[PDB]
Paper text:
High-mobility group protein 1 (HMGB1) is an essential and ubiquitous DNA architectural factor that influences a myriad of cellular processes. The HMG box is the defining and characteristic domain of the HMGB family. This domain comprises three α-helices with an L-shaped structure, in which helix I and II form a short arm and helix III together with an N-terminal stretch of amino acids forms a long arm. HMGB1 box A is an exception because Ala16 at the 1° site cannot intercalate DNA but Phe37 at the 2° site can, and this is thought to be responsible for the superior ability of box A to recognize pre-bent DNA.
These duplexes form a pseudo-continuous helix throughout the crystal. The structure also contains a single hexahydrated magnesium ion and a network of water molecules. The two box A domains bind in an approximately symmetric manner about the dyad axis of the palindromic DNA decamer, with water-mediated interactions between the domains. Two box A domains of HMGB1 collaborate in an unusual configuration in which the Phe37 residues of both domains stack together and intercalate the same CG base pair, generating highly kinked DNA. The two phenyl rings of Phe37 are parallel to each other at 3.5 Å, a distance indicative of π-stacking. Thus, this collaborative binding mode, whereby the 2° intercalation residues of two HMG box A domains act in the same base step, has not previously been observed. At the kink in the box A–DNA structure, the minor groove widens, the major groove narrows and the DNA is underwound; in particular, the C5G6/C15G16 base step has a roll angle of 74.85°, a twist angle of 4.82° and a rise of 6.64 Å, compared with standard values of a roll of 0.60°, a twist of 36.00° and a rise of 3.32 Å for B-DNA.
Residue numbers in the entry:
A (entry chain A), B (entry chain B): 5 to 79
Amino acid sequence: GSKPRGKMSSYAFFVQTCREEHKKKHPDASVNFSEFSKKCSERWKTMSAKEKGKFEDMAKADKARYEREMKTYIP
Amino acid sequence: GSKPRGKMSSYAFFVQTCREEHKKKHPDASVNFSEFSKKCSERWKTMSAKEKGKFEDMAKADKARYEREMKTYIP
DNA sequence: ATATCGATAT
DNA sequence: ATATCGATAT
DNA sequence: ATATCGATAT
DNA sequence: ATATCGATAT
Ligand SMILES: [Mg+2]
């Protein structure tokens, strides 16, 4: 086998949603990576635990994917 | 210890020099990652075999770094 | 360490 | 797999 | 890309 | 066994 992909954190899932939002608001634009990161991170800082929760549940699931795949990985 | 950093390819070393060039030509601009990557890769394609050679020697050395460090890595 | 945002190369 | 280009969070 | 590994065909 | 191809993992 191959080395399993690293764990995707709750923030990593959240960044994907930021990019979705951004695409709808600016369907044309190239992403300014530096500004985009700063904006997502400022938005995440102000989110409540409720809004966060769905991203935490994605992360819990990927933590499970990762633990499962690592069982069989032989380096 | 920690996992050694992955091998830096001849191109990865080149992209650092592209950014240097770019900063001198456009000190004020934020990097458009998508466009930067496309321009770096066009430049790499047309760069002379002599110029490329120096990046290939950095990569050879980093390969040696990596092989040495991996001897003592325990996952 | 490794991942996201894009594109790319080794 | 892993790295670059920037900033960031887990 | 590339180094390495396995299956196949000889 | 060995030469080759081409998948696999990096
Ligand atoms: Mg990485």
